[PDB]
């Protein structure tokens, strides 16, 4: 089919052309063993899901009105930061200890600046393989970038 | 007290007299859904072989010899035909 032909040829078209150096820094990427060790760390810091969020709202009403507190009884939340705009904003503060950047993404221009920007600020960035993988840890279909700003002792 | 129409639009009612007789009988939507169970379901499946559910009474434990012998003699004739056809 036409759609199958075009997607295969597009892949072929990329490899035959000389590619500019800022592009194709991607495709050099984190190795499987190092990548596997990264994900252990991030999955422990999975964000609070919608079901849990609903439960957390009910629990605070029972405690907060009756005794005290401004919701402050509830403990601190530690989780990864998934929005591109947010993470770029986290960089430059600069608060972010690790950034993971997906190798893929259809605009491409979206994430080309991020390797260079991280270098200038001196955030320790990585380029983990696959955007769907980043999605899974953050309860999205695809996440584009994921940064972890805080950590348990 | 719900009712499915032929059309399959699920609706809660009280008193099944309240719904009209024409609406449940005739079709409002194009894909109506049965009612009438066919003739061809009600007829029996076809007898291949004859299965006899009543046991022979040679097969009894503690049988009488006239039955128990007649059990062996009838199936010996079944077997020896096949052994002849084998040899």
């Amino acid at each position: 089919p036409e759609y199958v032909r075009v997607q295969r040829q597009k892949k072929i078209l990329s490899i035959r052309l000389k590619v500019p150096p800022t592009i194709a820094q991607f495709q050099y990427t984190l190795d499987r063993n190092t990548a596997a060790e990264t994900f252990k760390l991030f999955n422990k810091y999975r964000p609070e899901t919608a079901a849990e969020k609903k439960e957390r709202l009910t629990k605070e009403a029972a405690a907060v009105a009756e005794g005290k507190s401004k919701q402050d009884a509830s403990p601190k939340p530690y989780a990864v930061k998934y929005g591109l705009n947010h993470v770029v904003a986290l960089i430059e503060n600069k608060k972010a200890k690790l950034v993971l950047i997906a190798n893929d993404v259809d605009p491409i221009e979206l994430v080309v600046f991020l390797p260079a920007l991280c270098k200038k600020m001196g955030v320790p960035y990585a380029i983990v393989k696959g955007k769907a993988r980043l999605g899974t840890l953050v309860n999205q279909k695809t996440s584009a970038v994921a940064a972890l700003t805080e950590v348990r002792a | 007290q719900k009712v499915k129409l032929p059309s399959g639009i699920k609706l809660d009612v009280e008193k099944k007299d309240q719904i009209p007789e024409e609406l449940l009988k005739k079709s409002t939507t194009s894909w109506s859904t049965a009612s009438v169970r066919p003739s061809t379901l009600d007829i029996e499946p076809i007898a291949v072989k004859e299965f006899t559910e009543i046991p022979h009474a040679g097969k009894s434990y503690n049988p009488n010899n006239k039955a128990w012998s007649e059990l062996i003699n009838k199936e010996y004739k079944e077997e020896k035909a096949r052994e002849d056809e084998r040899i």
Partner: protein, 371 residues
């Protein structure tokens, strides 16, 4: 009208092939075979085959097109499609992981059940009590055999409970007219409101799965007949008129697990077999089969004590002692000593025979079927 073309009309219309059925339904062959047992649409011979199949002489399964047009609707068929999605959406939950969303998806679902399809196929109670004969064999078959892959325990532990319900109704209400022990287990007969019902309990011995036979058919037949016998036992219990389903004492269940467990409770007999063995107390020995004796002694109303119960841990009022050993030592002067043949011979006549005959270690009068 113009000239009409050949393989449209007649035998060609009336019948369709299993390929064509499974295509037109859009179901697949695993789940087409299930629906044809629930309905149940059975296969056919056309008389003229070479008209029907275009014209192969070729080995084929035909079905009646009208029977599959009735099947095409059918609100079970939707719940098969709903399951197909539910499985696809569970794989996503695990294949993200993301476990607790799958644990939610497990709980929030509605399994199909055949209740409408029972009560249209059998309308109703004399029609069902006709065919309940055929159900009772297979439940007593599947109750006995050991749990595996292709089966699993829950299907068997359903069948044990559904059968041990059926025994307790027959034991309480006392309907056992003909008994017949065989090599192939034990046949009974019972007159449950008019029509008489034969059924075959196997002996409890640990055997055996051949692995030629298709379970993926027979479990659907079991699932159909399990629900059928639920609706019958619901009616029989309440009309008697006891509570359904009956609760069961656990500390009793841990002694034997059988018919003495289950206890029946509320909100003279048809004779003469019921109220045999009244004012009559049996002490059945270890060696004999408890599972076919206690049933007949309770269903022909008299009291039982088993040796088999004692190992878990009175003999005051005991009259009879059923035992089948070569030598016996020592025997009590008050007590009567017989072999379990006596119980089977007594019920078929319904006289009570003499107990001078039988008795260990003596030879017997033969047995005889009542058929």
């Amino acid at each position: 009208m113009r000239i009409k073309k050949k393989n449209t009309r007649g035998n060609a219309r009336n019948f369709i092939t299993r390929s064509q059925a499974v295509r037109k339904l859009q179901v697949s062959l695993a789940d087409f075979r299930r629906l044809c047992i629930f309905k149940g649409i059975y296969p056919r011979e056309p008389r003229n085959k070479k008209k029907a199949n275009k014209g192969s002489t070729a080995p084929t399964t035909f079905y009646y097109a009208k029977d599959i047009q009735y099947l095409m609707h059918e609100p079970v068929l939707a719940k098969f499609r709903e399951h197909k999605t539910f499985a696809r959406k569970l794989t996503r939950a695990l294949g993200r992981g993301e476990v607790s969303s799958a644990k939610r998806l497990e709980e929030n679902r509605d399994s199909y059940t055949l209740d409408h399809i029972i009560k249209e196929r059998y309308p109703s109670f004399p029609d069902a009590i006709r065919d309940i004969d055929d159900a009772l064999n297979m439940l007593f078959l599947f109750s006995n055999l050991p749990s595996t892959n292709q089966v699993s325990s829950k299907i068997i532990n359903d069948a044990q409970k559904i059968c041990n319900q059926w025994l307790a109704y027959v034991a309480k209400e006392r309907l056992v007219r003909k008994v017949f022990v065989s090599i192939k287990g034990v046949y009974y007969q019972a007159n449950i409101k008019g029509e008489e019902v034969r059924w075959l309990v196997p002996f409890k011995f640990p055997e055996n799965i051949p692995s030629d036979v298709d379970f993926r058919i027979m479990l659907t037949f079991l699932e159909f007949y399990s629900t059928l016998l639920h609706f019958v036992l619901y009616k029989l219990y309440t009309d008697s008129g006891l509570i359904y389903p009956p609760k069961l004492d656990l500390k009793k269940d841990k002694i034997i697990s059988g018919l003495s467990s289950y206890i029946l409770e509320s909100r003279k007999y048809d004779s003469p077999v019921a109220s045999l063995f009244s004012a009559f107390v049996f002490y059945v020995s270890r060696e004999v089969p408890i599972d076919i004796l206690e049933f007949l002694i309770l269903s022909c109303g008299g009291n039982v004590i088993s040796e088999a119960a004692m190992d878990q841990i009175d003999m005051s009022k005991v009259t009879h002692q059923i035992v089948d050993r070569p030598v016996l030592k020592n025997k009590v002067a008050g007590r009567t000593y017989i072999q379990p043949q006596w119980i089977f011979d007594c019920i078929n006549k319904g006289e009570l025979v003499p107990a001078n005959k039988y008795l260990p270690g003596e030879a017997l009068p033969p047995h005889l079927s009542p058929w």
